[PDB]
């Protein structure tokens, strides 16, 4: 039954991708879509019926060499069960949503066939991520890690006739390989220190790792801190954290349904999953955890500032994903991993709705993506307007200030900000400031596209009409999670320590549980005792951003123009995204090409062959 | 059946002799007969070699199917296989039928083209079965003759220079090894490889000219064998023959050049260098680690700067063999098994990639990357095959490419972390040039007049790739099929190496 969830999407993708000419594109679309809904149904049954006893389901031996053995296997615990419903539910809805969104695509002439290929990629992308989350060993985790990398490369560059898509897909693959550089080095170090890659066997030896010095390069390091850092480098790339983020905003070149799947369920969340799955190690690696907090906090602040000035609708949401993952890494860094997954679970709901809602806006507006030509539209697409409004309420953290009554992101974000206050003063202030920016650019998105006067060309505005039911029903389903997910799961994830202990079935060896928290780790308890001003600070930051956005686009709509003139250098800085792409071209891309040419003509040509030909 | 290795070795050569004698005519019908006879012979050799594979017993680390006969000049004709060489025999016999099938559209001197490949097959097989020191050298250097003519006759515009560089540069390396082999013959009193695997060659330092020879006679013998195998592998900086020979050769010649002939360098290290010169191997380990690390970074960057599609694939091979050399000299269970798996894996992937170059070369008669673009628009099947083997080339998990790279890197990490870090950068650099080549050739829009009428892969071209796709996936998902065969033999080899190290 666990195996069907894992392998049914793979079999459907192979049939749809390779054999649609035999059965037809329409049948191939239903085959993939129907299989995900069956897998999603089984995923929910596994999640709701889980009894807290982790299960191991062998499949096949993968790599066996001397004392090294890694197997194809399924591990089912609380941590996996959470990821099962997230991956299959969002993937299933994207399949259903895609049936209408890709019904007629202008990127392809009538001669070209694309529908069956698109649905085959979605099913395989799902299979890759299901392999990542069910992994019982680090090696199978790497397979799913690289599987989503190649599956994303196929989908970002789906429109292969566009150079921008091909560049973005290539960039995403290469930047993620830089992350897998560190992740591979972590696997090598873990195996030789512990003699295993299996999670349970690793976690048994973690206490001894914290007292072990391992030589790496020019010096000796604490084994736990070094291996924690190396594995996090892999997570930075997959979650598009600072210095490894530039690929995510360029991934918008793919079809909109791909973005909802990449940004909400599969790729970005994998990095957070790895840290939470490896919490037994990080709880014994204090210095690795500190680095995770700084990167998480800085990414949360960085991506929030950049999104303030973006004019493309999908790029505003893309940078919001980078910012939101910054929050999750702060929670994990301070040692509260349930809060990190609580936000991951709620984020999957309302983020997937923001992209699918944005796609509906793009779908209605003749595939225009620039918010400067989206005036009006509140009345022309009512169901898309309310789907996006609920998503904004969730992401901005709308709720009753001092209670536990509010939208999904109200409860999961306030859990992290309280944890940050008890964990890091640096992180706490960067998170509340970033929360203020989150409200501004979220409400800037709503006001620029749904309010004001119809702006831009009038041909698309007059023809704007609501998307078909096949596209709106998935939005409705997600809205159910974007409203009740936070209140439903607040208790099991963050509410009560005893309740959290049994839910995750958590110095003794840190084994047997979905997550581990060290006995000396009390940040979760201190978070509940945070002062009132700390608990309400997210709300005040939210209102401050909302009022600023309202004063900038509804009232006195000339303020955004005047301010940018007053501060032109800073405006260019944010608009150009802090110039990371330009910097990397200067330091990495161009020097690498120059070095290769010099080695080719200087080394092989003039020095080596020059000598051989000389003699 | 009792002479099973001798049959697979000399059946391809015997068939070539019969073909030369009794196959008359030069018209198309004569050429058609030659192609079929070569295909049936190569297929027969593959089927016979499957009997060796399926009756092979991995637990027995000694040599199996051994046959011994008297020979000339006091030497013995001895053949046999163990867990280290059995899979290279099957690789050689597996690629030959596919290579012949790919040459089905050639019309220039077909009978001689079939004869050259049939003769080459027999000589390539003997390298992996010989258990006599001189006999191994005979097959090792005899293969240079047919390949010298394959490049010269059916090669590109610079084939005359490439053929001479390939022969003389390889011949120069091997003659030094010949003198070392004679010395081992004189010291041990035998050319029997099984006997030499247990002989203790002196390892005490002595002064030769103005330098101390750290490792004694073992180091002198090691260097002679290293010079031969380093050039064959090839290692950096003795690799510059390869971008000439592999590029100027015909498509089929390039398949065998990269898929099989390169493996004779890595197999030599596992058969002679470590088993027979363990002290010298331990001393040379630091230098071999850095030569291999440089090769990965150096040739990966050089591949990124190529304007010629076949030169990207050619330079990719040197980078991949860099992993093999590291794994072999890491001299632990994980490194050595990874090295063998990498060598076998590179055979399928590199062979497929050269066949991918051939598919579009046969249509446009140009290897320039800038001459193509948007082939996916007219060539759907080719774009899918070319992407699959592009992914295998960058070591994507699930393909056989990942397993070999992962194991060699982990074995080296145990010894030297600096080398492991530099070598591990290959994952970043391989993706850079491999994906850039695929994009520039296959993706984009079709805007050139010369490509408006290009055709997709024909049924025969597709069927050549299907066996290569299957093997890459099967070993990527179930590598135990290989590590079970090589496992016990590598463990015995690693144990001997450790026992021989100085105390
Ligand atoms: C990356 C560079 C690697 C590096 O810095 O190596 C550190 C080197 C690692 O050597 P080790 O094993 O720790 O000790 C070597 C002793 O010599 C112990 O030496 P030994 O007794 O084992 O015997 C000598 C051993 C010493 O070998 C070594 O490990 C040291 C020298 C290795 C070569 C250095 C890199 C070569 C080029 C790299 C380019 C890659 C792209 O072998 C060699 O001498 C090998 C020589 C290399 C031959 C290759 C040259 C081909 C032509 C070019 O350690 C240091 O020298 C200390 C750390 C210095 C780091 C500086 C790097 C810059 C900042 C980054
Ligand atoms: C390290 C560096 C980190 C710096 C982080 C500080 C962030 C403060 C930003 C200061 C203003 C930047 C600035 O001048 O941008 C300008 C924007 C205005 O919005 P717009 O719709 O893009 O206007 C475009 C206009 N039509 C134009 O072309 O110019 O301005 C804005 O979007 C204003 C948003 C201010 C934030 C409000 C919340 C806090 C209260
Ligand atoms: C062992 C002893 C076996 C007996 C000797 C075999 C001699 C082959 C033979 O019958 O003669 C060559 C044959 C006849 O040619 P002929 O009738 O003169 O002209 C019409 C047909 N070409 O015509 C041929 O078949 C000529 C074919 C020439 C070979 C092809 C060229 C490429 C190189 C082939 C592989 C390398 C062969 C050299 C290996 C030995 C090196 C010392
Ligand atoms: C890439 C690196 C390549 C570097 C060259 C490789 C080394 C080549 C050495 C060949 C083998 C020579 C050898 O083993 O020595 C021969 C002989 C040992 O035999 P011996 O002890 O005389 O036994 C008598 C039998 N009753 O004599 C000895 O004891 C040693 C005599 C050494 C002969 C000179 C070697 C010079 C190396 C070649 C220079 C480069 C060209
Ligand atoms: C192990 C994992 C390996 C992953 C790397 C290989 C993936 C191959 C994907 C093929 C993409 C090639 C580029 C492209 O656009 O392909 C076009 C081709 C034909 O597309 P089609 O829908 O048939 O329509 C005809 C075109 N108008 O499109 C296709 O042929 C699509 C094939 C569907 C495959 C679905 C993904 C499942 C993974 C397949 C792994 C094995 C592939 C072996 C064959 C290649
Ligand atoms: C972990 C802590 C932080 C680490 C700091 C490093 C951060 C990562 C640096 C990433 C640099 C960007 C890589 C991608 C470059 C774009 C490639 C592409 O597809 O563009 C199309 C681009 C041009 O196509 P166009 O944009 O369509 O014109 O293609 C190329 O330029 C071909 C490939 C060039 C070679 C890339 C080599 C990358 C080397 C990175 C080494 C990192 C070492 C640091 C450790
Ligand atoms: C290139 C720049 C390398 C700078 C690394 C400095 C790390 C430091 O000072 O903190 C060590 C710091 C304190 O010492 P410890 O006792 O080893 O923890 O440890 C770490 O946090 C190690 C984390 C791994 C750092 C990457 C090293 C490889 C590059
Ligand atoms: C053209 C190649 C023709 C076949 C090459 C020789 C196959 C050897 C099979 C054994 C022959 C036999 O039974 O005669 C016994 C005879 C003498 O040894 P006996 O087994 O002690 O009678 O063996 C030979 O004639 C050995 C010939 C080896 C030639 C290798 C040269 C090329 C490499
Ligand atoms: C294989 C399928 C059946 C099986 O389990 O085999 C028995 C057997 C496994 O042991 P058994 O099941 O105990 O008989 O397979 C082998 O021993 C060989 C497995 C194939 C290894 C191929 C290595 C790649 C290089 C050689 C060229 C490709 C040859 C393709 C054939
Ligand atoms: C450095 C160590 C030595 C490396 C040697 C690598 C192998 C040689 C690579 C280049 C070969 C050039 C082939 C030219 C082909 C050609 O055009 O021929 C027709 C042609 C003859 O005239 P045609 O037939 O009228 O065109 O060649 C020439 O015109 C050029 C003649 C070049 C002569 C080269 C002979 C010496 C090289 C082989 C021996 C090397 C011994 C090294 C000793 C020191 C060891 C440490
Ligand atoms: C059905 C699969 C047949 C066996 C797969 C291997 C042969 C490749 C497929 C050839 C199909 C065909 O009609 O021949 C075209 C092909 C002719 O070349 P084309 O004109 O490029 O298609 O004929 C052959 O492949 C002849 C050799 C077939 C040997 C099969 C054993
Ligand atoms: Ca020995």
Numbering used by the authors:
A (entry chain L): 1 to 506, 551 to 659
B (entry chain M): 1 to 503
Question: What's in the article?
Answer:
During processing, relatively poor map quality was observed for the distal membrane subdomain, and classes that lacked density for it were again identified suggesting the subdomain was lost prior to reconstitution. Different membrane domain conformations could not be separated, but the final map still exhibited lower resolution for the distal subdomain. Two hitherto-unobserved periplasmic β-hairpins (β3-4) are present in the Pd-ND4 and ND5 TMH6-7 loops, and the ND5-TMH14-15 loop contains a substantial flexible periplasmic insertion. The insertion includes 44 disordered residues that are predicted with ‘very low’ confidence by AlphaFold. Additionally, the intrahelical loop in Pd-ND5 TMH12, which protrudes into the membrane and dips towards the periplasmic side, is unusually large (11 vs. 5 residues in other structures). Finally, two Ca2+ are observed on the periplasmic ND2 and ND4 surfaces coordinated by the ND2-Asp260 carboxylate and L477 carbonyl, and the ND4-L197 and P275 carbonyls, but with unresolved densities for some of the coordinating waters. As CaCl2 was present in the buffer and the Ca2+ do not occupy known functional regions they may be bound adventitiously. No intact connections to the cytosol are observed, as potential proton uptake channels are broken at ND2-Tyr231, ND4-His246 and ND5-His263, but may be expected to form during catalysis. The 13 Å gap between ND5-Lys238 and ND5-His263 in route 4 is obstructed by several hydrophobic residues, including the putative gating residues Trp247 and Leu24854, as observed previously in E. coli complex I15, whereas in other structures, including the mouse and bovine20 enzymes, the histidine is observed in a different orientation, pointing toward Lys238. Following this gap, ND5-His263 is connected to ND5-Lys413 on the ND5-TMH12 loop above the periplasmic ND5 cavity, and Lys413 may connect to the periplasm via ND5-Asp414, His404 and Glu418, across a 5.6-Å unobstructed gap.
Respiratory complex I is pivotal for cellular energy conversion, harnessing energy from NADH:ubiquinone oxidoreduction to drive protons across energy-transducing membranes for ATP synthesis. Complex I transfers two electrons from NADH to ubiquinone, feeding electrons to the electron transport chain for O2 reduction, and captures the free energy released to transfer four protons across an energy-transducing membrane, generating the proton motive force that powers ATP synthesis. All species of complex I contain 14 conserved core subunits (or their equivalent) organised into two seven-subunit domains: a hydrophilic domain that catalyses the redox reaction, and a membrane domain for proton pumping. The core subunits of human complex I share higher sequence similarity to complex I from P. denitrificans (Pd-CI) than to other bacterial models such as Escherichia coli or Thermus thermophilus.
